[PDB]
Ligand binder design. Structure first.
Ligand SMILES: Nc1ncnc2c1ncn2[C@@H]1O[C@H](COP(=O)(O)OP(=O)(O)OP(O)(O)=S)[C@@H](O)[C@H]1O
Lengths: 375, 50, 148
């Protein structure tokens, strides 16, 4: 009988909620009008510490200045190398920032994928154990090597076949360990301003040594688009001085805190004898193709995501194909899946595998210069 | 002409622009172009094509 | 066999994704043409434009070379957004070498937006932002100008 108290409480709910929400957005947008006090700044980077209260900043289009802080902007934080926000009129420092530059360091840094198992293809005989010693064990205990007093194993070279001991079967224990696994495809050091090579060597290490036991990995040591010439015209000491400054900031002169080098390639032709000394490549290692039963391994792990009957002759594909590549067995699985797409079947029959044997192992045979070992 | 010296290349960018707007993907039309060179062996086979 | 590879590996993702899902595989991302400059490369992209209707998108090479700086990377992102709006994306670029250059190892100068459009093209393209509705067509004259 008194629903006009609820027609007044409903007027309260609706009208007060709507006017309060409109005036609440008007409160935050009156604060956006109050941002006509917060009217702009400049941004520069500290280039040096001039005096304890002065700094030289970098206008990004041009000139360099003398600034101070606001009052309490932590003058120890503003080291040369930080980025600050600069005042508009007084031009002095207002607020620190992060950032840094070109993503050719970044797109090789943390685009880095991982394998869904330790056995992504197979053949983990020396792999698990010796890679385990060269990375994980002195990072767990440096004092064992401090019975001798030397840095951790200076890193193998995964050489052999291009593709079972080159890029595949490189990230086996890396999937398990997961500490500081970056990528360096070594084309990102051959720069434009050619002395940025050593600067990006500093940018490699001085960004790496955070995840403290670092993984210095380098696929394809001398990589740029194309092939390579010999000890004549300009197929020259770019590699040598670049690689010796690599080895400079790897070990020898400068390193810190149980960083593990890992080199992995067989493509380059020109390499340093001083690369090949004990102390920078103290241990090295070799990889066979398969031993024909690692063929069975890489096939039985390549026989993964395939609908079948369970009748796929592994001996026929192992012995009848000769690819010697997990990527070759990848192509085998791919084209056998396409020949189940052909003839319209969900299952990949063993004869689709032999069609893959035929077509893939014949298109496989359109290659020359099937051998690679430096020096 | 390009290997690890990295010098003069922008004219080649202009010339590839010329090939792009010249021929292939809706070329000229009622336009008859005569060219001349003393050096045929310094040409590009991105214009040698009939 | 090149028509086989072309149609049967690009147009079948346009019509049969589940046929990859019934078997448990994954269609390739990135298809590249190369060879001598007379065998017909643009013709295959035009045969795609004819015999398929899944939003053919040309893209000319030195059009991406910019002077008002910052336009070509935005333009490539616009191209992938626009072809994303019509989800099966037939995407072709001719003379990829004219925008994907061997990074020249020399000082004192350099055009920059070739690198900017290159980084953003590889960014929008593959690796970062993966998507199964990108059908990458590209044709060039030469191969040893390109980047690994
Ligand atoms: N199978 C073919 N049948 C008919 N004409 C063909 C065939 N293959 C090539 N052509 C001819 O060759 C030319 C097409 O090749 P191009 O237009 O050069 O392709 P493309 O993309 O320009 O190659 P480049 O490397 O960029 S010059 C035209 O004159 C076509 O008529």
């Amino acid at each position: 009988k008194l629903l006009e108290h609820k027609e007044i409480d409903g007027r309260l709910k609706e009208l007060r909620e709507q006017l309060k929400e409109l005036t609440k957005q008007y409160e935050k947008s009156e604060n956006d009008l109050k941002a006509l006090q917060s009217v702009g700044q400049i941004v520069g980077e500290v280039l040096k510490q001039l005096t304890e209260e002065k700094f030289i900043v970098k206008a990004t289009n041009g000139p360099r200045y003398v600034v101070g802080c606001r009052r309490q902007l932590d003058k120890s934080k503003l080291k040369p190398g930080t980025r600050v926000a600069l005042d508009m009129t007084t031009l002095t420092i207002m607020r620190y920032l992060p950032r840094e530059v070109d993503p050719l360091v970044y797109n090789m840094s943390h685009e880095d994928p991982g394998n869904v198992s330790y056995s992504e293809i197979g053949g983990l005989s020396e792999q698990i154990r010796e890679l385990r010693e060269v990375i994980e064990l002195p990072l767990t205990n440096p004092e064992l090597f401090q019975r001798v007093g030397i840095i951790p194993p200076k890193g193998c070279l995964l050489y052999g076949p291009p593709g079972t001991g080159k890029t595949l079967l490189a990230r086996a224990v890396a999937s398990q360990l997961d500490c500081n696994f970056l990528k360096v495809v070594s084309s990102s050091i051959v720069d434009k301003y050619i002395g940025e090579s050593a600067r990006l060597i500093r940018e490699m290490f001085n960004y790496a040594r955070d995840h403290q036991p670092c993984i210095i990995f380098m696929d394809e040591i001398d990589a740029i688009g194309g092939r390579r010439f010999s000890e004549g015209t300009s197929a020259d000491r770019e590699i040598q001085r670049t690689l010796m400054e690599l080895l400079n900031q790897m070990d020898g002169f400068d390193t810190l805190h149980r960083v593990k080098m890992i080199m992995a390639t067989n493509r380059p032709d020109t390499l340093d004898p001083a690369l090949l000394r004990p102390g920078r490549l103290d241990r090295k290692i070799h990889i066979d193709l398969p031993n024909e039963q690692a063929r069975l391994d890489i096939l039985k792990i390549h026989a993964g995501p395939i609908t079948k009957h369970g009748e796929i002759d592994y001996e026929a594909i192992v012995k009848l194909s000769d690819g010697f590549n997990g990527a070759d067995l990848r192509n085998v699985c791919t084209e056998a899946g396409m020949f189940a797409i052909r003839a319209d079947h969900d299952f990949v029959v063993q004869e689709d595998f032999m069609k893959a044997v035929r077509k893939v192992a014949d298109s496989k045979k359109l290659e020359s210069k099937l051998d690679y070992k430096p020096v | 002409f390009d290997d690890g010296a990295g010098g003069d290349n922008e004219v080649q960018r202009t010339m590839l622009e010329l090939i792009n707007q010249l021929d292939g993907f809706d070329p000229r039309g009622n336009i008859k172009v005569l060219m001349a060179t003393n050096r045929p062996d310094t040409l590009d086979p991105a214009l040698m094509r009939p | 066999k090149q028509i086989q590879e072309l149609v049967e590996a690009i147009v079948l993702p346009m019509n049969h994704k589940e046929k990859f899902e019934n078997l448990g595989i994954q269609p390739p991302k990135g298809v590249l043409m190369y060879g001598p400059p007379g065998t017909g490369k643009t013709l295959l992209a035009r045969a795609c434009a004819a015999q398929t209707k899944a939003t053919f998108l040309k893209l000319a090479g030195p059009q991406l070379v910019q002077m008002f700086i910052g336009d070509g990377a935005k333009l490539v992102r616009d191209a992938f957004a626009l072809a994303k709006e019509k989800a099966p994306s037939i995407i072709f670029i001719d003379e990829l070498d004219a925008i994907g250059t061997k990074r020249f190892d020399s000082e004192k100068a350099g055009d920059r937006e070739v690198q900017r459009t290159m980084l953003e093209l590889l960014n929008q393209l593959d690796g970062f932002q993966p998507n199964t509705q990108v059908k990458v067509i590209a044709a060039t004259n030469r191969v040893d100008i390109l980047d690994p």
